Design a binder for this molecule. Sequence first.
Ligand SMILES: [Mg+2]
Ligand SMILES: [Mg+2]
Ligand SMILES: [Mg+2]
Ligand SMILES: [Mg+2]
Ligand SMILES: [Mg+2]
Ligand SMILES: [Mg+2]
Lengths: 115, 196
Amino acid sequence: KFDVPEELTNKALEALELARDTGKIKKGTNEATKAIERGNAKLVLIAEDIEPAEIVAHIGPLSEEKKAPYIFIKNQKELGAASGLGVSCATVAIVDAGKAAEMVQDIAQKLEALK
Amino acid sequence: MVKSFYGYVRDAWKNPDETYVNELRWERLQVWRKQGSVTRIERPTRIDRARSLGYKAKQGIVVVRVNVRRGGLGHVRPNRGRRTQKMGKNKVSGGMSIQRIAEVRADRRYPNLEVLNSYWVGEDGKHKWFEVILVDPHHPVIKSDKNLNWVCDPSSRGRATRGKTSAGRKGRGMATRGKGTEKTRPSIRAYKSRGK
RNA sequence: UUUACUGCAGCCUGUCGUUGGGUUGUGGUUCUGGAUGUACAGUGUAGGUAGGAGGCAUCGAAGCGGGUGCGCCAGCAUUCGUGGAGCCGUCCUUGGGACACUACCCUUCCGGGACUACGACCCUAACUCUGAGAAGAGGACCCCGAUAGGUGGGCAGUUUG
RNA sequence: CAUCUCAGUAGGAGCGGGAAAAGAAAUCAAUUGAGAUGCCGUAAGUAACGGCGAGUGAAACCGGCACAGUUCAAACCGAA
Ligand SMILES: [Mg+2]
Ligand SMILES: [Mg+2]
Ligand SMILES: [Mg+2]
Ligand SMILES: [Mg+2]
Ligand SMILES: [Mg+2]
Ligand SMILES: [Mg+2]
């Protein structure tokens, strides 16, 4: 996969902030995994600086098996911040786009193309 | 199914040479060989194993990776009289398992803590690696915790050195009940060490 | 003390693990284009044993070139062409098998593609040595763990009525 | 005398309290039962092992002492 350009990742973060304002987000790897498995995950954001890599190694193939768009954020600090959280977050899932449904689907199409 | 991500970690470590854990193993063993005997780490390598063994993300709980050599009890040939049954020592491995050796070295490095449990995390032709979970019985966070404040009792000090961890009880023959445990429970020493 | 008995170290060597990636050489793994199968003569190549008889065809069936599968420069397959009727057998070419275009798994056929045990070579990326390091030299060897056989008065348990 | 015995004894190292360890069955049974652990009695010098030599050597059932049950990991929730 080509490195997703910074504008697309920033749009993903903006969509995450917007869904935090209005919609519903599952922050945390357990909640995001449950949301992907249940098929409720509109968009999955995955941090790239995870130690160990076992924490979020399954998210990609799982979301590709369940047809959930996903993107890799640079690191977990601002990923946790975008979800309004005082800690880091290895992955968040947007289960309710709220006011970002249009931008979430735009990001989904862009990810589908860039693949 | 709706399985937790701990289940995915468990699956990845079930057959590690057939999953992505093999490449992580190739990259990690270099770093681990560079390290010493007892290394503290921020997070467990296998989070599901640590959590099922009692690890919690709270203050007073420490996880450490220990390095232990392979093979049996490195033994010296006696230089005095023996009866040919006690002369040979090359094939005599010990009665102390490698995991319990790792637990006791971790305990030695951390005099104020108590070993909770440990799990296998890797090995090569010369070393095995275990991650040992240790608890601080004198931390107020641990004292408040009602699932862990048993470790603040006087009989819980020196757990790993008295064979009271899961690996130690496995080494004492008390991993099972019934037949075969005639000379193991309640202790090895209670039957003149004839069990094990 | 030793070519006494019985062992144990050390050492030699096989195997497994450490331990990876490429190149070829060795076995079948797995299967496409052909059912390639034929003492005697054949109108005809048992079109595998067969509902012991019964389908196609100028909208295709041959006697020909090195004869594309093959083979006794015959003949089944319609093919690059041009020549202007191959049957099935109750006249069974008095059968090692005697024969309908009817899902061929089967002694062939060599794209043998794909994983595989042994062996040879190369690579570096693990690993080893040197250096404070850049790096240099080795290198999946060696070391090491385990196991198998050997050698072994080095040692040590005795026996030597 | 070599396996065996002496004996997991002697001795060693580590840990550690007023006790320690064990402890709530992936148990023991047997045709159908019991129901955490420890300790005592018995089974019994029996079963078992053994140059089947010398020797070594249980457990369950059963009778007592004392009795006690529970906490996590996960599923669901998601900082409550
Ligand atoms: Mg040390
Ligand atoms: Mg106790
Ligand atoms: Mg001598
Ligand atoms: Mg003697
Ligand atoms: Mg216990
Ligand atoms: Mg004895």
